[PDB]
Amino acid sequence: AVTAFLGERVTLTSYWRRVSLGPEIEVSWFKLGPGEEQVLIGRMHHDVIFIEWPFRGFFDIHRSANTFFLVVTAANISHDGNYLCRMKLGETEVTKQEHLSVVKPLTLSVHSERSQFPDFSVLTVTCTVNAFPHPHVQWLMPGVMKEKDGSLSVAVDLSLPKPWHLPVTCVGKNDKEEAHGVYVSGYL
Amino acid sequence: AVTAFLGERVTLTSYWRRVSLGPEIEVSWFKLGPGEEQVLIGRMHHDVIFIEWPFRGFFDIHRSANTFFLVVTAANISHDGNYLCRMKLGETEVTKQEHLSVVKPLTLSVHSERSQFPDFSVLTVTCTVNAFPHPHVQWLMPGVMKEKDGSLSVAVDLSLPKPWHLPVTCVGKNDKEEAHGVYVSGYL
Amino acid sequence: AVTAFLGERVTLTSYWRRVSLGPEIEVSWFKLGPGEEQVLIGRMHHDVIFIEWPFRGFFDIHRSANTFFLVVTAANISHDGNYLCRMKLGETEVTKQEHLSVVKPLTLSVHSERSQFPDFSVLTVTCTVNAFPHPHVQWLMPGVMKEKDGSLSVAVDLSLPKPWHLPVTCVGKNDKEEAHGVYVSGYLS
Amino acid sequence: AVTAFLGERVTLTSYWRRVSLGPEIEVSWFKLGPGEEQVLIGRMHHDVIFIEWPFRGFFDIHRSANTFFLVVTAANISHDGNYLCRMKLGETEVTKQEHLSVVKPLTLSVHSERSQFPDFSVLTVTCTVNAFPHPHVQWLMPGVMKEKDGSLSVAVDLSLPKPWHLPVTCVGKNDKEEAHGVYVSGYL
Amino acid sequence: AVTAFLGERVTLTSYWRRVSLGPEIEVSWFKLGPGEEQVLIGRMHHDVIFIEWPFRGFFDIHRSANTFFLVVTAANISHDGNYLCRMKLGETEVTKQEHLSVVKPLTLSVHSERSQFPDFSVLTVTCTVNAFPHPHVQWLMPGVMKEKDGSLSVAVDLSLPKPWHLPVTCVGKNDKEEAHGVYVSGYLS
Amino acid sequence: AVTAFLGERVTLTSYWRRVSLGPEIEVSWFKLGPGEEQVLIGRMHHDVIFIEWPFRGFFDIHRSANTFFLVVTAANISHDGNYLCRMKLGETEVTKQEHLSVVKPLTLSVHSERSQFPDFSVLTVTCTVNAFPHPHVQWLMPGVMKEKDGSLSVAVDLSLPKPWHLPVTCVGKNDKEEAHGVYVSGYL
Amino acid sequence: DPSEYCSHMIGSGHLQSLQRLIDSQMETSCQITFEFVDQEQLKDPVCYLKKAFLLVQDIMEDTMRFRDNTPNAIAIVQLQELSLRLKSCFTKDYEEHDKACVRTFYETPLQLLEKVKNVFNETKNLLDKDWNIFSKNCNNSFAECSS
Amino acid sequence: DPSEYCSHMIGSGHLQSLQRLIDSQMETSCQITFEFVDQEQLKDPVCYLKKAFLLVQDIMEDTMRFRDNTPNAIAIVQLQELSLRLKSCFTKDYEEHDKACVRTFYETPLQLLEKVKNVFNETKNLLDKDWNIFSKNCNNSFAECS
Amino acid sequence: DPSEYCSHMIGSGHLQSLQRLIDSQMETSCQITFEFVDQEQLKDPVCYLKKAFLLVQDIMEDTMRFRDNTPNAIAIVQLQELSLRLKSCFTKDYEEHDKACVRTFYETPLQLLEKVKNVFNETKNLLDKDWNIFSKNCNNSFAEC
Amino acid sequence: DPSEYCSHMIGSGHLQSLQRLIDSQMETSCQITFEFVDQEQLKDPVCYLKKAFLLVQDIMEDTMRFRDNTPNAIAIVQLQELSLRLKSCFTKDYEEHDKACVRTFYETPLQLLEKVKNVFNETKNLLDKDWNIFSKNCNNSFAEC
Amino acid sequence: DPSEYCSHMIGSGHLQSLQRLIDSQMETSCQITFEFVDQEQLKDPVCYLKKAFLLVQDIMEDTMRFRDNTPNAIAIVQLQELSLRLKSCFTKDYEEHDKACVRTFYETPLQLLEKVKNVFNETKNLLDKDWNIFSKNCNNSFAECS
Amino acid sequence: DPSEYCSHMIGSGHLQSLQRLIDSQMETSCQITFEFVDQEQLKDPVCYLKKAFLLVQDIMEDTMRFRDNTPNAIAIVQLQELSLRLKSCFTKDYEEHDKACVRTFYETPLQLLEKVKNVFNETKNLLDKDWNIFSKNCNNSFAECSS
Ligand SMILES: *[C@@H]1O[C@H](CO)[C@@H](O[C@@H]2O[C@H](CO)[C@@H](O[C@@H]3O[C@H](CO)[C@@H](O)[C@H](O)[C@@H]3O)[C@H](O)[C@H]2NC(C)=O)[C@H](O)[C@H]1NC(C)=O
C-alpha cells in the first residue's frame, strides 16, 4: 500500500531509529512532483507544526513517540503520488519515501437510444465507466474524458439492428474492480 | 400509441371526413392540462398557419389533403399528455382527442463505497435509475428526485458486511424497459 | 419570389416531377453559405424526417404528394438567402434552388436637440431608420450600424440656425417601403 | 422660467436687496420635495461653499456681488420642480422660491407590422412618443410608461384592412413641441 | 488555559486515566453551541478516525498513548468557545471539557479630516481599533461594528478647533494587548 | 497654492486685466496632461458656459466681473497638477497657468503577528501608511502600492525576538504630515 | 326480414362501374384519410363483409365525390340507390358495436377505391350463394375487436 | 413548314377526351406541384400557347399517368401522337428562351387538367382561324419574361 | 391731487446731479441685481413712469449708497425729498398692481444709474408739457403685465 | 537722480482728488481682481512705496477708468502726470525683481482706491520729511519676497 | 490524630524502591497524560505536599501498573500500604478544595515517576523535622488556586 | 569458522536479565516503531532466527536504552559484549539480502522486549543442540522474501 479511497482520511508514517528521541528531530514532508521537484507540505520540530498555506486543511502532521504522521484529511486525486519525509538531527539527516494510491471507485452506466434516421430500427446502447486510476469499458460481442475531480471517463457504443439481440452485456473495470451493465429489454 | 422518445420529432394527425375539403376547415390544436383547461398551440385556415408564441419552434402545423398534422419538433417531457384538435366548417365543429407518450430511456448506474467508521469492512453499493415515466430500482436479495428535464431519479443502497457476497445484482426498470447492474468485485 | 417578414412562418418548396412519386424520394435541404457552401438543414425519406441539431426548432420538413416543404418557423435575418433541395431516386438526382427574402419593416424616428455653445440658437434634428435589407435616410432641404438582430441602422442630422425653418421633412426607405418624419415645432416659442 | 433641456447647464438666481452686501449673507438652497418638505442642497457663507453629498457634482453654488447662483451642471428629470433659497443676515431672513422646468425633447417613432392570422392583409402601424413632461400620440383618422431616466413613453396602434389607405399620419406632441410620423407605403 | 491566534494551528487534549489504555477508548469530540448544545466534530476508536463533513479539513483527531488530540488546523473566530470530549470504555463513560480562546491581534489606525463648512479650521482625527475579542478605543484629552471574519471594529473621533492642540494620543486595547496612535502634525503649516 | 484635500470643493481663478471687461472675453480652461498636452475642460463666452462631457459634474466655470473661476466640485487625485486658462479678446490672447495640489490625509495602521515556526517567540509588527502624494513609513530602531483612488500605500515590518523590547514606534509621514503608531504590549 | 331478392340486387353493372372509377383515376402520390374496418381486428369472413359493406355506404357520400351528371357521379348515385334497396338484407346488431372494428387509413384515392370494389365484389358473391347470409348475428365478432 | 393541314389536326374528339379525363377524376383536396407557363408573364395569347406547347409533352408523361389500355391512358397516347403531328405547326424560337416564362403551380389534379385542356382548345381555335398563326416570332415576348 | 407746481418740480440741478453720479462712477464689469419696472411688459410711457416712481423710492435706499455728507449722498437725499414732493402729482392706482410690471435685472451700477436718470429726465419732459399727465388711470396698463 | 523738487511734488490737491474718487463711488459688494504689491511679502515701508510706484502707472490705466473729460478722469490724467514727474525721485533697482513682491487681489473698487490713495498719502509723508528717501537701495528688500 | 509515629513511616527502603522503578524504565520519547498538583499555583511547600498526597493513591493505581509479584508491582503494593498508614498524619481540609490546585501534565513516564518520588522524599524530610507538620491548615493556600 | 564454544555463550544469566527488563517496565498504551524480521516472510526456523538474532544486536543500541550504571544498562552492555563473542558463530550470507525480510512494527516497548527475549531464548536453544547450526547458507530463504 498505502491505498486510500476518494474522500478518506489516510495516514503516512515515518520514524526515528533511536527510540528515545522524538521532539528533537526536525521533520519535513514533501509532495514529490513532475519529475524531481519536492514541494514542502509542512514542518514539525519540538511539537511545533506549521503546514504551508497551500496545503492547509488538506494535510496535517503530528508526532507520537519516535513516530511521525502525515495526515491527509480527505484523499483527493491530486494526492495520488510519492511523498518524502526528511528527518534531521543536527548534522544527520535520514530520508524516507512513501507512495500513496488514491482510488475512485468506478461508476458504470447504461442507457439506450433508438435511431431517428433513416428509421427507428437501430438500437445503440451506451456504456460509461468513470474511475481512477484506470477506467476501462467494453461490450461482450456475440475517447478519455478528464473530469473536474481529476477522474477519468470512457464510453463505448454498441449498435443493434432489428431484431435486437437482447440481452447485451457491458463490462467495466478499474483495476481488480469489476462491474457489469446488462440491457435486458427496450421500452417498445 | 403514439409514443415518442425524448428528442424525437413526432406527429399527431387529424382529418376532415369529407375528402374533397381541406383548406376550408378552420383547424386548431390545443394542449390539454390540469385538469380541463385547453391551451391554444396554433391555428390553420386556408394554409395560413399561426403558432402561438409560447409554442413557437416547439410545434408546427401543416395540411396534406383533408389531413391535418401537429408536429412536435423535439419531444420533451412536458409534451407527454392529451391533445385536442378542433375542426370547424362554418357552423359545424368536429373534435378529435389524441394522447402523446413521451419516454426517456432509462439510465442505470452502479458504484460502491466502503465505510470509514468504525472500520472499512462494510461495502455499500448504490444503484440509480433515471427514466420517464416510471423509474424503479431494486437489489436482488440473497426518495424520488425530479430532474430539470422533467425526468425522475430513484436510488437504492445495499450494505454488505465482511466477507462480501459478490457478485450482487441490481434490477432497473422503466415500464417494459429493463437493465441490470452487476457489481462483480471491489478494488482491494 | 418568396419574402417573409421577421418573425413570420414561411415555407419553401421543391418537388419530384413524376407526380405519382413522393415518399420514395430521398430529400435533403441545405442552407447555402457565402462560399457557395451547403450546410445540411435536414433529411426526409418515407415520411421519416430528421432535422440537424443546429436547425432543430428553426426549420422543419414535410411532404405532401410529390411536394417537399421546408418550414421556417419564425423567420430571422440569418435565414435570408439561398437554399438547395437535393432529391434522389436510385441513381438519379435532381436539385432545386430557392431564395428566401427576410425583411424587417423599417422604424423611423425623429428627435431634436439645441446647441449649448456658443449659444442655444442652433437646432439639430435627427432622423434615424432601422430596417433590413436596405435602410436609407435623408433630410429634404429648402455610417451604417449593425444591430444584434442582424438589422441595420442609419441616421442623418440637420442643423438649423435661428430662426428655425420649420417644418422639416425626413424621408426614410427600406426598398419600396417608405415613411416620413416631420419636425413641426420646438418646445419653446 | 426657467427652462432647461435634459443635459443642459442651468442656473437659478437669488439676491440680497442691499446691494452693499454679499459675502455676509448666509445662503442656503433647498430642493422642495412633495410636499411641505425641503431638502438641503448646499450652503454658502463668507465665500465658503458646501454642497451636501447627495447633490455633489449635480449642483453647485457661487456668489457674484449681492447675487447668489444655484448651478445645475447637467439638468436631469428629477431636478424639475421648485427651489427655495434662504438668505439670512443676522436675525433677519428673506426667502426666494424658484421653479425649474426640465424638458426632454420628444422622440417619435413609426413602424408597421402585417398580420399573420387569419391572413396577411391587415397592416398595424405603431406610433411611439417619448418625452417629458407631456408626451402625446394620436393617429389622424379618415397607457403611459415611465423610463429609467424619468421620462414618459406612450404608444398607439392603427390597424388597416385591405386596401390600405396610405399614407397615414400620427402627430406626436410634448407641449408646443410637435413632430409627425407618416407611413407612406409597405414593402410588398 | 489554551489560546490561539487567528490562523494558527492549535491542539486540545483529553485523556483516559488508566495510562495502559488507549486505542480501546471510543472518543468523540463535540463543539458546544450557545444552548449548551453538542455538535459532533468527529469520532475515534482503534485509531480509526472519522471527521464529520461540516468540520472536515478544519479539525482533525489523533491519539498517542492515553491521550486524545483535537487539532484545529487554522484557528478562526468561530472556533472560540467550548469543546467536549466523551470517552467510553464498555458501559463506563467520562467527559472532559475544554475552552479554546481565539484572538485576533488588534489593528490600530489613525487618520484625520478638516472641516469644509463653515470653514476649514476644525480638525477631526479618527482612531479605529479592529480586534477580537474586546477592541477598545479612546482619545486622551488635555458603535461596535461586526466584520465578515467575526472580528469587531470600534472608532472614536476627536474634533480640534484652531489652533490645533497637537500632538494627540489615542489608546487602543484588546485585552492586555495595547497600541497607541499619535497624530503629530497636519499637512499644512 | 492652491491646495485642496481629497473630497473638497476648490476654485482656480484667472482674470482680465482691463477691469472694464468680463463677459466679452472668451475663456477656456485646460487640464495639462503629461506633457506639452492640453485637455479642454470647459468654455465661457458671454455668460454661456459649456463643460466638456468627460469633465461634466467634476468641474464648472463661472464669472464675476473681470474674474473667471474654475470650480472643482469634489477634488480627487487625478485633478492634482497644472491648469491653463486661455483668455481671448478679439485677436489678443493672454494665458494663465495655475497649479492645484490635491492631498489625501494619511492613514497609519499598526498590527502585530507572532511566528508559527520554529516557535511562537518572534513578534512581527507591521506599520502601513496610505497617503498622497508622499506616504513614508519607518520603524524607529534601538515597495509603493497604487490604490484604486490614485493614492499610495507603503508598509514596513519589524521582527522582535524574545524578549520583545516594547513599546516600539513607527513614524508615518505625508509631507509635513506626521502620525505615530506604537505597539505597547502583546495579548499573551 | 331478408328475402330471396337479396341475391339479385348487386349486379355486374355495379361492379363494372366500380372498375371504371378505378380505371379513370390519375396516378398520384397523394393521400387522403378515411375510415374503414380493419381486417386485422375482424377476421371472420361474413361479419367482416357485413360491417365493411354497411360502412362503405355511409362513407360513400363523403369520400367518393364527382361532378353532377358525370358518368362516375351517376355510378355513385346508383350504388347509393342500391344501398337503400339492400336495407332489409342486413339485420342490425347491437348499437354498442357501431364504432367497433373501425380504423382510419391514410392512403391513396386509388387505394380507397380498390378497397371499396373488393368489399362490393365479395358482398355480391356471398349474397349470390345465400340471400340470407347477412342475417348472421355478428355481435360476438364485433366484441372481439379490438383483438 | 407549317401548312393548311395544321388547321385539321386537333379534332373535337381530342377535346372530348380531355373533358372525359376531367369529368372522371374523383374530388379530393389533394394538391401536386407541376411546372407550367406563367400567364402573368406571357400575356400575349399566341406566344403563351407557343410556349405551353413546348411543355405539354413532358407535362403529360410526368403528370397525366393512367393504367395501360385504360380509356384515359389511350386518350393520353392519342394526345401524344397529336403533339408529334403538330410539331410542324410551331416554328422554333431562340433556345435562350427554353426555361423562360415558366412557373411552378401547387394545384389540384383537376386544375392541372383544365390548364392542359385550355392549351389544346385555344390552339385548336387559333389554328382554325389561321393555319400559320404559330409561325409567329415570339422571341420578344419571351424576353419580356420575367 | 396734482397742481401747476408739478410743471417745474424737477429742476435742471436735479438732472445735473444725476449725471454727476454717472460721470463719477468707475467703469467696471461688476453686476448687481435689483428690482425695477419691466419695459417689455409695460410699454406705455406715461404708466411706465408712474410705476417706476413708486419704486425709485426704495431703489435709491437699497441700491444707491454713499457715505454720509458726501456730494453724491447729498444728491440722493435731495432726490428722496424731490420724490416726497412728487407724491401728489401721481394719483394712486389699485393696490393689486403693486408687484405687476416688475422684474429683477442683473446689471452694472452704471446701467442702474442710466435707468434711474431716465425716469427723472422723461418725467420732466412730459411734466413740462402737461402738468396733469400723471392723473392718468393706469389700472388697465398695469393689468396687461 | 533726485532733488529738493520731490519735497512737494505731491500737493494736497492731488490728495483731495483721490479722496473725491473714494467719496464718489457707489457702495456695492462688487469685487474685481488686480495685481498690486504684497504687503506680507514686502513689509519695509520705504521699499513697499518704491515697488507700489512702479505699478500704479499700469494699475491706473487698467483699473481706474472714467469717461473722457469727466472730473475723475481728469484727476487720473493728472495723477499720471504726477507719476511721470516722480520717475526721477525713485532710483532703479535690479530688473530681476520686476515681478517680485507682487500679488493679485480680489477686492472691491473702493478697496483698490484705498490702496492707491495710501501709496500717495504715505509717499508724501516720507517725502515731506526726507526728499532723498527713495534713493534707498531696495534690492535686498525685494529679494526677500 | 497525627503523632510521633508519623516520623517513622516513610523508610529509606520505600525511597530506594521508587529509585528502582525509575532506574529500570527503558528510555522512549513516549508521553502520557496524568493529573497532578500545579506547582505554579501551590507554591507553599507544606500545602503542596498535603495536596499531592491526596492524589498519590489514585495516581499510583491508574498510572504505575506492573505485572503481579514482580519487584516493581510489590514496591507499588508497599507504597499503597504506606499511604494507608500515613492517612493519620494529614488532617483534612475543606472538601470545597478537592479539585483545586490540580493540573494535567503531558509527560514522560520517567517524569511521572520523578514527581512521585519527590512527594515521598519531601514528605519524609518534612516529617523527620516535625511529626505534626501536615496538621497545617491549608484552606487559604488552596483558595489561592487558581 | 564456528566452533564448539558457540554452544556455551548465551547463558541463563543473559535470559534472566532479559526477563528483568520485561518485568520492570511500566504498562502503558504507548507505541514506538522499530525494525524487526517478520515471521510471515521468513518461515524457515533456523534462518528466521539467524537473521533475527543479528538484527536484534544492531538494533539494540537504538531501541534498548537505560541510564548508565543501572542494572538494565549493565544487562544491555553484557548482551552487546556477548554479541561480539558470537561473531564467528554466524557465517555471513549475500550482502544483497541485508535489507531483506525486514519490516517495521509500531508496537509497545514491552512488545519489543517480548520479541527480543524470544529471539534470544530460541537462538540459545538451537546453539545448545548444534554449535554449528548458524553456518547454514540462508540465501535461498532470504531470496524467498518478500513472499
Ligand atoms: C476623478 O475625477 C475624474 C474627472 O476629472 C474622473 O474621471 C471621469 O470619470 C467619469 C466616470 O465617473 C468618466 O465618464 C465615463 O466615461 C466612460 C467611458 O468613456 C463612459 O462609459 C461613462 O458613461 C462615463 O461617462 C470620465 O470620462 C472621466 N473623465 C476624465 C477626464 O477622465 C475620475 O473617475 C475620478 N477618479 C476617481 C477615483 O474618482
Buried b (16+ CB within 10 A) or exposed e, C44-67: bbeeebbbeeebbbbbbbbbbbbb
Q: What is the CATH number of domain H1-146?
A: 1.20.1250.10
User: What nine digits make up the cell of J86?
Assistant: 516722480
Q: Which residues contact D126 (CB under 8 A, 6 or more apart)?
A: D109, D110, D111, D112, D113, D155, D156, D157, D158
| Integer Cα distance of E157 and L106 in angstroms | 63
Q: CA-CA distances (angstroms) from residue A124 to A120, A168, E42, E185?
A: 11, 11, 48, 83
Residue with cell 481599533: E129
- The answer to whether F171 and F128 are in contact (CB under 8 A) is no
| Integer Cα distance of D177 and D173 in angstroms | 5
Same CATH topology for F1-104 and F105-188: the answer is yes
Amino acid at F79: H
Q: How many residues does chain E have?
A: 189
- Assess L77–E contact: CB distance below 8 Å, yes or no: no
Every domain of chain C and the residues it spans: 1-104, 105-189
Q: Which residues contact C18 (CB under 8 A, 6 or more apart)?
A: C66, H62, H65
State phi, psi for D127 to the nearest 5 degrees.
-120, 125
Indicate which atom in ligand 1 lies nearest the CA of residue F72. 5
Residue D75 CA to ligand 1 center (angstroms) comes to 18
| Integer Cα distance of A146 and A138 in angstroms | 19
| Integer Cα distance of C77 and A75 in angstroms | 54
Residue I144 DSSP class: T
CA nearest to A171, candidates A127, A126, A106, A105: A127
3-class SS of residue L123 = helix
| Integer Cα distance of E67 and K107 in angstroms | 11
B105-188 topology per CATH:
Immunoglobulin-like (2.60.40)
Residue H127 DSSP class: H
In what side-by-side order are the strands of the sheet with D59-64? D10-15, D67-72, D59-64
Residue with cell 366548417: B89
| Integer Cα distance of I145 and I42 in angstroms | 6
Q: What sign has the CA pseudo-torsion E30, E33, E35, E40?
A: negative
Q: Which residues contact I121 (CB under 8 A, 6 or more apart)?
A: I15, I18
Residue D13: its chain I contacts at CB < 8 A? 33, 104, 106
**Residue G79 parent element (H or E):** helix G71-86
Angle K12-24/L12-24 helices, nearest 10 degrees?
100
Give domain L1-147's CATH architecture.
Up-down Bundle (1.20)
User: What nine digits make up the cell of L18?
Assistant: 532479559
Residue D133 DSSP class: S
Residue with cell 431616466: D149
* Count of C-beta atoms within a 10 Å radius of residue L11: 12
Give domain B1-104's CATH architecture.
Sandwich (2.60)
Residues just before a chain gap in chain A (C–N exceeding 2.5 Å) are: 142
Resolution to one decimal, Å: 2.2
Q: What's the CA angle centered on A8, arms A3 and A9, to 5 degrees?
A: 95
Residue G33: its chain C contacts at CB < 8 A? none
User: What nine digits make up the cell of B181?
Assistant: 447492474
User: What nine digits make up the cell of F110?
Assistant: 499598526
User: What nine digits make up the cell of E170?
Assistant: 489615542
3-class SS of residue B160 = strand
CA nearest to D66, candidates G89, L126, I30: I30
Q: What sign has the CA pseudo-torsion I53, I56, I58, I59?
A: positive
How far the first Cα of chain B sits from its last, in Å, is 49
Residue F54 CA to ligand 1 center (angstroms) comes to 6
- Residue whose CA lies nearest to ligand 1 atom number 10: F54
Is omega for the bond preceding C167 within 30 degrees of 0, making it cis? yes
**Residue K129 parent element (H or E):** helix K109-129
Indicate which atom in ligand 1 lies nearest the CA of residue F78. 1
Classify burial at D162, counting beta carbons within 10 Å of its beta carbon; exposed 0-12, middle 13-18, buried 19 or more.
exposed
Farthest-apart Cα atoms in chain F, separation: 81
Residue with cell 428553426: C58
- Assess L147–E contact: CB distance below 8 Å, yes or no: no
* Count of C-beta atoms within a 10 Å radius of residue B90: 7
User: What nine digits make up the cell of D132?
Assistant: 417629458
Buried b (16+ CB within 10 A) or exposed e, C93-102: eeebebebbb
Q: CA-CA distances (angstroms) from residue E130 to C32, E137, E144, E177, H29?
A: 68, 9, 10, 12, 87
Amino acid at G74: I
CB pairs under 8 A between B and E: 13
E strands, G69-128, are 102-107
Q: Which chains touch D (3 or more CB pairs under 8 A)?
A: B, C, E, F, I, J
Cα within 13 Å of Cα(L60), Cβ side:
25
Chain-centroid distance of CA F171 in Å reads 20
Q: What is the dihedral of CA D78, D79, D82, D83, to 10 degrees?
A: 130
CB contact under 8 A, D50 and E119: no
- The answer to whether C183 and C165 are in contact (CB under 8 A) is no
* Count of C-beta atoms within a 10 Å radius of residue G21: 23
**Residue E28 parent element (H or E):** strand E26-33
- The answer to whether C18 and C83 are in contact (CB under 8 A) is no
Residue F55 CA to ligand 1 center (angstroms) comes to 7
Residue F57 CA to ligand 1 center (angstroms) comes to 10
Task: Kindly list the protein residues whose Cβ atom lies closer than 6 A to any atom of ligand 1.
Answer: F 54-55, 58, 76, 78-79, 149-150
Radius of gyration of chain C (CA): 24
- The answer to whether B130 and B96 are in contact (CB under 8 A) is no
Q: Which residues contact L75 (CB under 8 A, 6 or more apart)?
A: L17, L18, L20, L21
State phi, psi for D108 to the nearest 5 degrees.
-105, 135
Which residue of F29, F60, F76, F102 sits with most ligand 1 atoms within 8 Å of its CB, as the best mutation to test the pocket?
A: F76
The answer, yes or no, to whether F and H have at least 3 beta-carbon pairs within 8 Å is no
Buried b (16+ CB within 10 A) or exposed e, J86-103: beebbeebeeebeebbbe
| Integer Cα distance of K71 and E122 in angstroms | 87
- Any bridge partners for residue H102, and if so which? H37
| Integer Cα distance of C48 and A4 in angstroms | 53
* Count of C-beta atoms within a 10 Å radius of residue E92: 7
CB contact under 8 A, C50 and A119: no
| Integer Cα distance of C28 and C44 in angstroms | 6
Helix ranges (DSSP H) in chain H: 12-24, 45-63, 71-86, 109-129, 139-143
Amino acid at H33: T
CA nearest to E47, candidates E31, E18, E27: E27
Give me the residue from C9, C114, C182 closest to D180, CB to CB: C182
Q: Which residues contact L93 (CB under 8 A, 6 or more apart)?
A: L137, L138, L139, L142
Q: What is the CATH number of domain J1-145?
A: 1.20.1250.10
CB contact under 8 A, E57 and A62: no
Question: Which chain J residues in 95-124 lie under 8 Å from chain I, judged by CB atoms?
Answer: 109
**Residue K83 parent element (H or E):** helix K71-86
Indicate which atom in ligand 1 lies nearest the CA of residue F76. 1
Residue with cell 347470409: G133
CA nearest to K47, candidates K136, K121, K146, K124: K136
CA nearest to K34, candidates K58, K13, K53, K51: K58
User: What nine digits make up the cell of B170?
Assistant: 441490481
How far the first Cα of chain C sits from its last, in Å, is 52
- The answer to whether D129 and D138 are in contact (CB under 8 A) is no
Every domain of chain G and the residues it spans: 1-147
CB pairs under 8 A between A and E: 37
CB contact under 8 A, K65 and E20: yes
Q: How many residues does chain H have?
A: 146
| Integer Cα distance of A38 and H106 in angstroms | 79
- Any bridge partners for residue H36, and if so which? H103
User: What nine digits make up the cell of K16?
Assistant: 530506594
Pairing mode, strands A67-72 and A10-15: antiparallel
Q: What's the CA angle centered on G8, arms G5 and G9, to 5 degrees?
A: 100
How far the first Cα of chain F sits from its last, in Å, is 50
| Integer Cα distance of A50 and A71 in angstroms | 13
Residue with cell 406541384: H33
3-class SS of residue A98 = strand
Q: CA-CA distances (angstroms) from residue B13 to B19, B67, H31, I23?
A: 15, 7, 18, 105
Amino acid at H75: A
Q: What's the CA angle centered on C72, arms C69 and C78, to 5 degrees?
A: 130
Classify burial at H84, counting beta carbons within 10 Å of its beta carbon; exposed 0-12, middle 13-18, buried 19 or more.
exposed
Residue of D nearest to J25 (CA): D20
| Integer Cα distance of B110 and B169 in angstroms | 10
Residue A118: its chain C contacts at CB < 8 A? 43, 45-46, 48
| Integer Cα distance of A134 and B109 in angstroms | 18
User: Chain E: nearest CA to L33, how far in angstroms?
Assistant: 13
Q: What is the CATH number of domain C105-189?
A: 2.60.40.10
CB contact under 8 A, A184 and B179: yes
- The answer to whether A83 and A30 are in contact (CB under 8 A) is yes
CA nearest to E156, candidates E184, E125, E131, E181: E125
Q: Which chains touch B (3 or more CB pairs under 8 A)?
A: A, C, D, E, G, H
CA nearest to C176, candidates C101, C74, C81: C101
Q: CA-CA distances (angstroms) from residue G130 to B170, G84, G136?
A: 64, 19, 11
User: What nine digits make up the cell of L88?
Assistant: 564467528
| Integer Cα distance of C183 and D173 in angstroms | 10
User: What nine digits make up the cell of J28?
Assistant: 456695492
Residue with cell 340470407: G132
- Assess B183–G contact: CB distance below 8 Å, yes or no: no
Q: CA-CA distances (angstroms) from residue L66 to A18, F131, K24, K63?
A: 12, 66, 7, 20
* Count of C-beta atoms within a 10 Å radius of residue D50: 20
| Integer Cα distance of A164 and A124 in angstroms | 10
Buried b (16+ CB within 10 A) or exposed e, I19-57: ebbebbbbbbbbbbbbbbbbeebbebebbbbbbbbbbbe
| Integer Cα distance of H110 and G66 in angstroms | 11
Q: Which residues contact H66 (CB under 8 A, 6 or more apart)?
A: G23, G24, G25, G26, G27, H72, H73, H76
